[PDB]
Ligand binder design. Structure first.
Ligand code: PUB
Ligand code: PEB
Ligand code: PEB
Ligand code: PEB
Ligand code: PEB
Ligand code: PEB
Ligand code: PEB
Ligand code: PEB
Ligand code: PEB
Ligand code: PEB
Ligand code: PEB
Ligand code: PEB
Ligand code: PUB
Ligand code: PUB
Lengths: 52, 177, 374, 164, 164, 177, 164, 164
């Protein structure tokens, strides 16, 4: 959904995060995704190097 | 290097078809929000050296081991290259504010940086801390909420643009870590 | 013949290579210029000749005499580079603390703009070293006929994207030896890390094995830190030229699955090509049938207006050279939607994505012992 | 891609400075001229298919010999490629028209066109016949606005002067 | 002098091309923002002498130690040079204000200022005291309408960020 | 860079002795078969341009997604670099025909190709397909069995030499894969 | 190794072109002169051992002082090296004679010869005495017909002019 | 001019050496192939005028559209230039045929031909029509020897592969 483009989504908290994928790199806010997607029957788990 | 215009064009070439209506509508919102972008970049062009000095001084004061011997801010020359690198990061973030797309920031500055700071022994978390201080300071100047500086502008909502600038700083921070 | 010659002989090579996209183009002090133009060209020179290395204002005073002479226009730019490379600055960054392979390799980069071709050339320039010192090395690089022909007296050296490339491995070198726009020479070589307090650091060399013996630099070293990447032209190749970042938490099961997938895709690929020859013109027997019964179907034009002509009669205006077969907007628009529709095309992209994934695994499976299995 | 934004950012990058008020005035001019050109691009994406029809039909209306022998237009399939390349160029006129510099039209269409067209026996005079037909079928009052029309003329001028 | 015209001409000259519609659009931006800045330049040439007065008087209102010893303001004559240099800078703000880029203020005032000021024991903080006083003094509605004032603040910002 | 002469000489220096009989006998066969070699290279060099265009155009016609958006033959520039690559490969194959030894082809062009096409994103399967088409085309011109060109030469058997040229093309196609 | 083939292939490679008819005429001349030179190589591999004997024996027939002192010919073993090096040179004459350019004789024998001979106190005049003896013992119309002899003269000329 | 002599002299000059036996064998091959090519050049200077007639008449026999509109052959005068440029090419085939390398035909005819022909809207396909007509016209066993005809084929091949 994010490969190429860059999308900005509000979280469960009131704040907002930009999610982007440039050159096969997917990053959410400050820290890059380290493991891509893990299906869990109500959405996805993405795994991240550091705490936002 | 791609602006928002060339981003719409490249996406439409992936679609391999004419631009049409909707993409141009989003780009019309870019044009009508253009003067806010101009005044925002004006707010970051002017206060940058001070922001850079403050952010790196805050980086040293939060983490005093940099000024300690055998740290990467120890030698006077290393402090000079430190201040200059903060200035250059803020410079390409300002370019990403004019362009509206992060292709200038990704191609010119971001790509080749993590491996460089690793190859030099530069602590990366300290750099991301300095990028975070430039982020908060840049959003405070961009929202006219700085304490020592409150310049008059005609009022209006600009939260979109603040999220945009925070996205670029977030991007720079993400790249280092 | 598409092209005349090498980088030096003709410049058609520059025209359809990556060169046009890059900020790797020559810079000139044009006549009488203000401080803005002088300062531009002098920095673009400092960026290329030191390889983005970092010159403090104290070290600028070393280079200052020569800088002033170039700001005149008394010195040609090649004599300026000559005076740059003879400076104690440039000795300290490169000649003072380097191994000889590394070093000679550098003056190919800064002076010529190219990576060395063969071991024999490298040894030739080393023999020139032991003959007449650092100084006559620098003189030998600047007074070369290839140098003069390509750059001339004016142009600051740049990375030449000449599509000729004598040896492909020398290309892979030339992208590896300059590590993109953020990097510099102190980063690529651990001069700074090795040296105490950011100084007196011996320069490390790599790829010596590739100069000596017939080897190849990694797709990683050419793909991560490159002028290919900084001068990115925003390509919608389903091929990604960028390396996927190494995923964490890799297990061997994940990798046997991908290897098996690659082999299955190769098999399906060969079968589909071999069929593809078989297709011929299946439509061709019916086409020949229609060619046969042409006197019944083909019809001549009635010359008239929209009024006053029997219906389904073609006017000479509506002899469109695409309505004459009966094609449409679709028919010219078809080959652009062919990636999804075509079976063979679909397979090729899958193969390549699978191969990129396979390598990224080959990195990640290498890690042993202490891995949190997932 | 050469645009206003990329030229001023790239020029300021080569300068080694923050973007001063000069670049700001340049992008100010971009957002001034933007509406006129984008009207041009909207109308081009409106009726491009009829531009393919009249363009290619005038292109074979002038040169008929292409359909005569084996040379460049032997089959109906090569005629499909003919109209196809015309639509590539019109699509690049749309792209550069949206961006506002000649960037994508240069790096996608013009770059290395001469080795290809020289190699595959493709005459440029037929392309130029097509484009000159399109600039002869342009009315300032009607269709796109006069300011839009001017920018369309400029882009298509650059196409011909690139090819010729 | 870095302006709109010089940057786009120099850019296209280094390109080796005719100036396409991007430089033209960029140039249009200059002739769009022209009126706002020129209003600013006219008002600067209006009351510049009182700007020298307020500026320097605040400059010694902050730092008194200059008048104390031999160092930089030993005599009345050096103080006359102090106000004199301030008038140099204001006149360069008038020039860059007319050009519209930071061109002449960069090449005539800022370039090589660091070796001069460092050499002759001139503190930069006193200049920045002066300029910061001038930026603070302005009221937009009353004197320089809106954007004229904006352009004036931009220029004087650049003076401080050049010195600091 | 080594011809058949220098190959015999290098082998004799590994043996560390003089030249002798049998090596020279095989080299005598090289000299007497020289006219065939000359005419083969001349034929290959002539109309060389036609072969390259035909090969790459057949690569595209077998596999239409190259000309599709985001294929490596999509942009006009990409078609240019594509034709150039085909031309350089045919060029070094012609050098290998004159030399009689593939030292030139291995050291100049073949070595480090995989890094170059992997690192650029060029699909390997397609590249070897184009090498295969240049192989068949080149052998048909070298045997005077081309349909569009049948020039008079004194007739004779030259299968040795055709197997030699096919050896070089198979070396390239096996090298890119 | 410099030969006809390597010079014209390397020159065409540096040219960036297909090998045109000029290179083809060059290798045409190589296959013309080939038989004459190869006759020379066959006869050299015939009686090389007596060339060792007469060559070295004339080499000490001229200079006797080498056998006198410790300097270069102190023992019989150094004399075995003296003959040995002569057989190296004759083997390189055979090699360059086969190749037809002076390539292997240059890169194997002549390259770096002067630092070695100067370093290890080796006089070149004794080598030149040996080779001049071999060119004085040229039996042309009876042993090496005409042009085989000529090619041998040329190669051995190049040996002396390389050393002297 | 690239010939055998210039390539080997220039290569040896770049080497920094006297001309060794390799270059001598190269010019030996030149003087071997020389008579065959020169027979070709004598016969070309024999009937070049009829080559102009058949060449240009076949060139407009294929493409008639050049005589049709204003495009490249509007007048009889431009047709005179058509035959004229063909005679320039035949004269360069005579020159390179005499020299024996593709030198003068490269530096006089081919170099920078693409910018000129692309500039002045000159199609290459009509040249190629002319030359392909000439390749067919020569009769090898009645008009020329195999060596002479062969060299003529090679030179004119190089002309087409330069232009196409
Ligand atoms: C260049 C203009 C050529 C002249 C002159 C000539 O006589 N033929 C050209 C070169 C040539 N091509 C081949 C072999 C093949 N060419 C192929 C490409 C075409 N086949 C297609 O289906 C399409 C798309 C519709 C194209 C463009 C293919 C495939 C082959 C066969 C490949 C194989 O594996 O054998 C040859 C050799 C055959 C011959 O003509 O004798 C030559 C000389
Ligand atoms: C004005 C100087 C002319 C003329 C103009 C007419 N144009 C007519 C039709 C028509 N025009 C175009 C070109 C236009 N459409 C586009 O989409 C673009 C650019 C994106 C351009 C420049 C097209 C494609 C068409 C066909 C579709 C249509 O009808 O709109 C036209 C109608 C002709 C008719 O129906 O007879 C006219 C009259 N009028 C004149 O007097 C001068 C010569
Ligand atoms: C032989 C393999 C042919 C063929 C040969 C014929 N050639 C005829 C005419 C003709 N040929 C040339 C080319 C020739 N003239 C030159 O001056 C040169 C080079 C300097 C060449 C290579 C020309 C220009 C002409 C026209 C003038 C003339 O008649 O001599 C010819 C006569 C054809 C006719 O009148 O019908 C023939 C028969 N004969 C064959 O069977 C094969 C195909
Ligand atoms: C006033 C707020 C200062 C101070 C001023 C002094 N400036 C002196 C010398 C000097 N100043 C400049 C800058 C000026 N010259 C220009 O051409 C331009 C712009 C075009 C400017 C802004 C220069 C270049 C120089 C050197 C040449 C000269 O002597 O005029 C100066 C003399 C210093 C000395 O000789 O010791 C003074 C005193 N006086 C102060 O008290 C405050 C800090
Ligand atoms: C408005 C946002 C302020 C403020 C404005 C006041 N300015 C006063 C005096 C004054 N202002 C200037 C700057 C102005 N004069 C020029 O010639 C130019 C540019 C060419 C500018 C930007 C000057 C030089 C002066 C002194 C001369 C004069 O009186 O006009 C002023 C009077 C202050 C007083 O007498 O107490 C005011 C009130 N008013 C405010 O509330 C905000 C802070
Ligand atoms: C060449 C340089 C250049 C600039 C720097 C700008 C500066 C500028 N901004 C505005 C105009 C404006 N600028 C802003 C911006 C703001 N919104 C806020 O919440 C913040 C205080 C601030 C961003 C940090 C707003 C909201 C307007 C419109 C004000 C209004 O109409 O009320 C205008 C008037 C014309 C217009 O409406 O666009 C001008 C000249 N324009 C230029 O040509
Ligand atoms: C285009 C983008 C771009 C960048 C982002 C920089 C990145 C960068 N920094 C350095 C180099 C450096 N960068 C720093 C900075 C640091 N000092 C510290 O205490 C902190 C950890 C950190 C600031 C947060 C220092 C100290 C050096 C010099 C290191 C040394 O020589 O020891 C170098 C090597 C060349 C040089 O010495 O300048 C490079 C490429 N350069 C570029 O061209
Ligand atoms: C001396 C020998 C020698 C070679 C063999 C080439 C090899 C080569 N090709 C490219 C580069 C290229 N090569 C191709 C070719 C391809 N297009 C496709 O559709 C096919 C997969 C393939 C032809 C069969 C393309 C398209 C590029 C440009 C790639 C890009 O920029 O995306 C490059 C990078 C520099 C450049 O852009 O030109 C190099 C070194 N160059 C040399 O110097
Ligand atoms: C991005 C822009 C862009 C273009 C503008 C085109 C340009 C272009 N056209 C062709 C290729 C072609 N173009 C034509 C077109 C012609 N037929 C004729 O009768 C006329 C002279 C002419 C139409 C006016 C034909 C026939 C071919 C195939 C030529 C052949 O294979 O013989 C090719 C080679 C690849 C292919 O076969 O498709 C390219 C690059 N492609 C691009 O990517
Ligand atoms: C300087 C340039 C130069 C050349 C280009 C060649 C041209 C050449 N080829 C042959 C001669 C020949 N050439 C070929 C070649 C072949 N025949 C076939 O049927 C195959 C299609 C083709 C494979 C290569 C053959 C078979 C002969 C005759 C056999 C032989 O002489 O060995 C001859 C002998 C004399 C004659 O026939 O009149 C000459 C001079 N030699 C040169 O000096
Ligand atoms: C492979 C190449 C090759 C050669 C070129 C010869 C060269 C050669 N000639 C002689 C030896 C000889 N060569 C000659 C020839 C000469 N008589 C004269 O009157 C003339 C000056 C001259 C002929 C022109 C004579 C006479 C001897 C015997 C000398 C003697 O024993 O006195 C010897 C010593 C061994 C022997 O006695 O045969 C050798 C190595 N041998 C080789 O193996
Ligand atoms: C030394 C070599 C050499 C050449 C090969 C020619 C090539 C050449 N031809 C022309 C110029 C020309 N050449 C032609 C020829 C053509 N007419 C057509 O119908 C055909 C397409 C074609 C003949 C086959 C024409 C018509 C012109 C004039 C073009 C014009 O003015 O429109 C020009 C420009 C100068 C001029 O007007 O004469 C040149 C350099 N000149 C040289 O010096
Ligand atoms: C010549 C090669 C050389 C070195 C390099 C040092 C390294 C060194 N530091 C030590 C130990 C040491 N090092 C520091 C840290 C250090 N001190 C500070 O006050 C600040 C600000 C620091 C970072 C800049 C501390 C705090 C200690 C504990 C001793 C102390 O109280 O200072 C010890 C004692 C180890 C032990 O107790 O077993 C050694 C060997 N010694 C050498 O011989
Ligand atoms: C003792 C070591 C030390 C420092 C150095 C500072 C550095 C500092 N500045 C901040 C943040 C900060 N800094 C400035 C810029 C600054 N303020 C102005 O009004 C003007 C004119 C400025 C330049 C002269 C602004 C505008 C902010 C945002 C907060 C605010 O509204 O003031 C923040 C908050 C970061 C965050 O929100 O995550 C820090 C840590 N803090 C320290 O502990």
């Amino acid at each position: 959904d994010v490969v190429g483009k860059s999308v900005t989504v509000e979280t469960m908290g009131g704040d907002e995060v930009t999610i982007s994928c440039m050159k096969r790199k997917l990053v959410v806010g400050s820290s890059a995704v380290i493991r891509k997607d893990v299906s869990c029957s109500n959405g996805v788990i993405h795994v991240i190097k550091s705490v936002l | 290097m791609l602006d928002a215009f060339s981003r719409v064009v490249v996406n439409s070439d992936s679609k391999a078809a004419y631009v049409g209506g909707s993409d141009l509508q989003s780009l019309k919102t870019f044009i009508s929000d253009g003067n806010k972008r101009l005044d925002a970049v004006n707010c970051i062009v002017s206060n940058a050296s001070c922001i850079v000095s403050d952010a790196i001084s805050g980086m040293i004061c939060e983490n005093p081991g940099l000024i300690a011997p055998g740290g990467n801010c120890y030698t006077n020359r290393r402090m000079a290259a430190c201040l200059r690198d903060g200035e250059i990061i803020l410079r390409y973030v300002s370019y990403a504010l004019l362009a509206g797309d992060s292709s200038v920031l990704d191609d010119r500055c971001l790509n080749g940086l993590k491996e460089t700071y690793i190859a030099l022994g530069v602590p990366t978390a300290s750099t991301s801390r300095a990028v975070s201080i430039m982020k908060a300071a840049s959003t405070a100047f961009i929202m006219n909420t700085a304490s020592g500086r409150k310049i008059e502008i005609a009022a209006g909502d600009c939260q979109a643009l603040q999220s945009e600038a925070a996205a670029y700083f977030d991007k720079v921070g993400s790249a280092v870590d | 013949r598409v092209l005349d010659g090498l980088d030096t002989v003709t410049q058609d090579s520059y025209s359809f290579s990556r060169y046009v996209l890059g900020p790797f183009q020559p810079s000139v002090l044009n006549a009488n210029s203000s401080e803005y133009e002088r300062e531009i060209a002098i920095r673009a020179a400092y960026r290329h000749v030191f390889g983005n290395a970092y010159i403090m204002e104290e070290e600028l005073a070393e280079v200052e005499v020569t800088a002033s002479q170039y700001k005149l226009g008394n010195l040609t730019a090649k004599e300026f580079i000559r005076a740059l490379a003879k400076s104690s600055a440039y000795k300290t960054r490169f000649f003072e603390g380097a191994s000889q392979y590394r070093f000679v390799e550098l003056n190919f980069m800064h002076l010529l703009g190219r990576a060395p071709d063969t071991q024999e050339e490298v040894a030739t320039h080393m023999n020139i070293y032991h003959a007449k010192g650092f100084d006559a090395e620098i003189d030998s690089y600047i007074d070369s006929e290839e140098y003069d022909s390509v750059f001339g007296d004016y142009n600051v050296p740049f990375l030449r994207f000449r599509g000729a490339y004598t040896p492909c491995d020398s290309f892979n070198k030339q992208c590896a030896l300059k590590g993109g726009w953020a990097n510099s020479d102190k980063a690529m070589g651990g001069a700074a890390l090795s040296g105490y307090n950011g100084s007196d650091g011996r320069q490390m060399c790599d790829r010596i094995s590739a100069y000596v013996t017939s080897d190849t630099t990694d797709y990683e070293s050419v793909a991560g830190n490159s002028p290919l990447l900084t001068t990115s032209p925003n390509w919608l190749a389903y091929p990604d030229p960028a390396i996927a970042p190494t995923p964490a938490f890799i297990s061997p099961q994940e990798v046997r699955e991908a290897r098996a997938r690659v082999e299955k895709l190769r098999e399906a690929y060969n079968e589909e090509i071999a069929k593809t020859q078989a297709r011929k013109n299946a439509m061709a027997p019916f086409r020949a049938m229609v060619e046969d019964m042409a006197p019944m179907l083909d019809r001549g034009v009635t010359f008239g207006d929209p009024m006053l002509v029997h219906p389904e009669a073609k006017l000479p205006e509506n002899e469109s050279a695409l309505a004459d077969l009966g094609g449409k907007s679709s028919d010219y628009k078809r080959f652009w939607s062919t990636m999804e529709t075509n079976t063979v095309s679909r397979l090729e992209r899958d193969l390549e994505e699978a191969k990129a994934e396979l390598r990224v695994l080959e990195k990640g499976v290498d890690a042993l012992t202490p891995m949190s299995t997932s | 891609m050469k645009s206003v934004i990329t030229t001023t950012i790239s020029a300021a990058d080569a300068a080694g400075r923050f973007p001063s008020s000069s670049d700001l005035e340049s992008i100010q001019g971009n957002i001034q001229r933007a509406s006129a050109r984008l009207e041009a691009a909207e109308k081009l994406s409106g009726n491009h298919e009829a531009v393919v029809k009249e363009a290619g039909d005038a292109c074979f209306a002038k040169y008929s010999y292409l359909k005569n022998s084996g040379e460049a237009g032997d089959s109906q399939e090569k005629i499909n490629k003919c109209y196809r390349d015309v639509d590539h160029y019109m699509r690049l006129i749309n792209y550069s028209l949206v961006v506002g510099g000649t960037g994508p039209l240069d790096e996608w269409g013009i770059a290395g066109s001469r080795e290809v067209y020289r190699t595959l026996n493709l005459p440029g005079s037929a392309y130029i016949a097509s484009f000159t037909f399109t600039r002869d079928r342009l009315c300032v009052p009607r269709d796109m606005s006069s300011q839009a029309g001017v920018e369309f003329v400029a882009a298509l001028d650059y196409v011909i002067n690139s090819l010729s």
